[PDB]
Each structure stands twice: as C-alpha cells, then as structure tokens.
Amino acid sequence: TQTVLPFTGLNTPSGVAVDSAGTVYVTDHGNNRVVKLANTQTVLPFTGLNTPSGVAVDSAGTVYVTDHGNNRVVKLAAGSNTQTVLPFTGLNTPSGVAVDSAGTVYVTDHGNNRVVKLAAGSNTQTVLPFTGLNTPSGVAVDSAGTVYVTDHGNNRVVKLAAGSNTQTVLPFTGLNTPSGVAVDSAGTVYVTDHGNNRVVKLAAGSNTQTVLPFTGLNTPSGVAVDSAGTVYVTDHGNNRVVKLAA
Hints:
mainly beta
C-alpha cells in the first residue's frame, strides 16, 4: 500500500531524489525551489532558480538540480549556503540530471536532443554517442556505468553500454510519452509511464513488465529508488509525492 509523504505548499512538482540515509528531495517547479524531507519539509539554500526540473544527489550529499528556463545546472556541496554553477555550455533547456559513483554529472540536454556528461572538476563537456532521439527526458546511471535515458518523443527507453557505443531499446510495452527513469543495484530499471498515469519497472534480463501498485496518479514524472527498493515517484497533477515499499 502506497503512502503520501508529508509535503506542504508546493504547486506542480517536478523530479525526485533520495539520499543514502533515507531523506527525499523534490523540486518545487512553481516556487523555483528545491524542497527536501528528512520530520517537516525544508528547502536547500538555492539562489536564483527559475522553474527547476530534475534533481540528483551525490555520495557525499551534493544535490544536483537543473534549471529548465535558466539553462543552468546548480549544485550544493555540504552544509553551506554557497552555490556552484557547473561549467555546462550550449545547454539549451536541459531535462533531468544523474550522477555517477565517481562524481560525473549526467545532464539530458532536451532542446538539442542529446545527453551530455561532465566529469568532476572538468571544464569540457562530453556528448554521449546517442543517436535517433526526440525530446529526451530523464537520465539514470547504474554501477556499471550504463546510461539509461528516456527517449521520450518516441515512447522508448534507450540504453548505452559502458565501453562500447551500441544503443539498444529496452523491452517495454504500452509506453506512451514516458518520463522519468531510475535504476537500482540489481539492474531493475524503473520508468514512469507518464501517458498512462502509472509507474513501471523491468527486471534485468526479464521479459515480464510489472506495473507498480500506485493509486491516484495524475501525470507522474520523477522517479527514484533507495536502498531497500522503495520507489519514490512524483505526480505532477496532484501536487504530492508518493512512495511504495518493496
């Protein structure tokens, strides 16, 4: 049985992210805000946001939130009110954001139909060998470096194997205008079927596609997963976040 997390005063939510300790993050789309939740909700000291979207967190707790309208990418290291704009150039309206275990930030440049990654402390961005995309959405990277991008404009989920540059399509059926993407340690990729108002998961090396028992979803989007396998998914139409334990 799903449960609604105690979130207050947010109009139209965007993405979601979960720490390694258990505290969840959300991007207050309409208030230009990045609210978190341990107790009672609270927002990080973000400065000068304008319609944020995706949100990811690092191993040390660094929160990575992008700005759709400002075409920026901001991060917050530890307990400080000092912001940092990542050296991303050419970002014309980016989409979600993911991070590697080594610190490499993955950004889905929506307006140009590409996915760009940037290593920690690097000034030169790197465009991934992704071919044949239309208005991409969420991005997710696992432990083996595999990049999971939701090529939204064609209702698919593409994959980029590490080392090689072979792009494959994940065996998904019934996908219509799909949004966020997530992945766990075992390899199960959680993709939010946004058009059918449902959250879907697909085990690694499996043909069976499983619809997650989420009740009351109105255009869901951002999807996250913690350690025990709890799936956190934001629904945009109801202005709330819902989690479902494994």
